């Protein structure tokens, strides 16, 4: 014979609130917080660091030009 489920009390369709409404606001707020903190940590620091590395690169370029010119001056024979 097919199984017979013993009779209980309750409930159903009442956990949809407690599993939906929670993340309906908490998840949105938490993801907004994550996006804000990630953008703040990432974008400005990356642009500033790239500018810093660019300045160091320009200084390296000047040093390379000076050394190349002085060596070409001496070695030119």
């Amino acid at each position: 014979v097919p199984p017979k489920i013993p009779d209980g009390e309750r409930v159903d369709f009442d956990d949809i609130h407690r599993k939906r409404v929670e993340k309906d606001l908490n998840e949105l707020q938490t993801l907004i917080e994550a996006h804000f903190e990630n953008r703040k940590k990432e974008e400005e620091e990356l642009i500033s660091l790239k500018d810093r590395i660019e300045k160091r690169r320009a200084e390296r370029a000047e040093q390379q030009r000076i050394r190349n010119e002085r060596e070409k001056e001496r070695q030119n024979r």
Partner: protein, 371 residues
């Protein structure tokens, strides 16, 4: 203690402890032995990579799914998959946790009996229970009525339920699912020049299907539009470059669901087997089933299917009834969420198949009262 809600599925094994929102570990169910020779010594090369590890070394493996259509065809590989799931993806010994497997409707008995025998002898669980994959998807929606179309990756089945009383004479199980759509897409891609043959490249075609294909609202108009303009051609970059451009293959692959004559299957589409499943029900519960049609399973995630199906059923159904299609955003894990809810219930706590009961009646206990 807590229960383990495993869900074998066919294509993705989803598991996790009972009482959460999402499965803890989701990974493809493939076991791939290496096929080449291997010359480096001491590299630590194993004999079989299972789960998500074989989706990264798939270049030199021969992946083979252990579950063909719901049924399990290779028991050793399935045992290996279960062992991996328990020990490495969850890291909980099964000696201290009840398990709740899931099984498609109308499956062979021997499959279910072997499943319970394995769970009780090899892994030695305290108690396990097998549940039909559609009732859980109905749990997750928070309903108690409705006809659920659970189009997985192995098999598409359509179980109608009213007021908690399932109708066993109205279950329409059809064996077209995501895998056949992958094969058909791989077969129609050859019309542009792209040939995928290896069992590893089936995964690439699956990714193409997931990311690009969509279900057309009206098939003939889309076929006419894609043949004149070029606003549909979306490109995609293979795992090595050489981008490809998919034209009207986009909506022709998932159209097979509504016209199974494309892959040579005789039966009617998923739009008409639902109506037939409804019409087999009694005359007084057809309105409720019309109003509470539920979608589940992975393959029902195509963009634009919840409108095509509603249009088709509204065409078939009487003009007065209201047709509503419930398509929750968490469709893929709907069965597992329902499984977690069912395992977390207090009323259900005495339905498990306790080990002493199995010792007294053998593996055939599953067909008995403890269903």
């Amino acid at each position: 203690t807590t229960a383990l809600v495993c869900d074998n599925g066919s294509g993705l094994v989803k598991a996790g402890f009972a009482g959460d929102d999402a499965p803890r570990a989701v990974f493809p169910s493939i076991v791939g032995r290496p096929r080449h020779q291997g010359v480096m010594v001491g590299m630590g090369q194993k004999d079989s990579y299972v789960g998500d590890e074989a989706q990264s070394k798939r270049g030199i493996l021969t992946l083979k799914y252990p579950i063909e259509h719901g049924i399990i065809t290779n028991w050793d590989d399935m045992e290996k998959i279960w062992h991996h799931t328990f020990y490495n993806e969850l890291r909980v010994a099964p000696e201290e946790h009840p398990t709740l497997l899931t099984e498609a409707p109308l499956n062979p008995k021997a499959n279910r009996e072997k499943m319970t025998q394995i769970m009780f002898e090899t892994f030695n669980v305290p108690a396990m229970y097998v549940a039909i994959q559609a009732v859980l998807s109905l749990y997750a929606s928070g309903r108690t009525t409705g006809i659920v179309l659970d189009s997985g990756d192995g098999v598409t089945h359509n179980v109608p339920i009213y007021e908690g009383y399932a109708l066993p004479h109205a279950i329409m199980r059809l064996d077209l699912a995501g895998r056949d759509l992958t094969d058909y897409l791989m077969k129609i891609l050859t019309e542009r020049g792209y040939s995928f043959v290896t069992t590893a490249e089936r995964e690439i075609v699956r990714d193409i299907k997931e990311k690009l294909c969509y279900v057309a609202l009206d098939f003939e108009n889309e076929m006419a539009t894609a043949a004149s303009s070029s606003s549909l051609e979306k490109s995609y970059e293979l795992p090595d470059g050489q981008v490809i451009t998919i034209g009207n293959e986009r909506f022709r692959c998932p159209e097979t669901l509504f016209q199974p004559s494309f892959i040579g299957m005789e039966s009617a589409g998923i739009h008409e087997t639902t109506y037939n499943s409804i019409m087999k029900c009694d005359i007084d519960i057809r309105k409720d089933l019309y109003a509470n049609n539920v979608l589940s399973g992975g393959t029902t995630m195509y963009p634009g299917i919840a409108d095509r199906m509603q249009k088709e059923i509204t065409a078939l159904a009487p003009s007065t009834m209201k047709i509503k299609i419930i398509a929750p955003p968490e469709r893929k894990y709907s069965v597992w969420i329902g499984g977690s809810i069912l395992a977390s219930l207090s009323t259900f706590q005495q339905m498990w198949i306790s080990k002493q009961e199995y010792d007294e009646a053998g593996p055939s206990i599953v067909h008995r009262k403890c269903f």
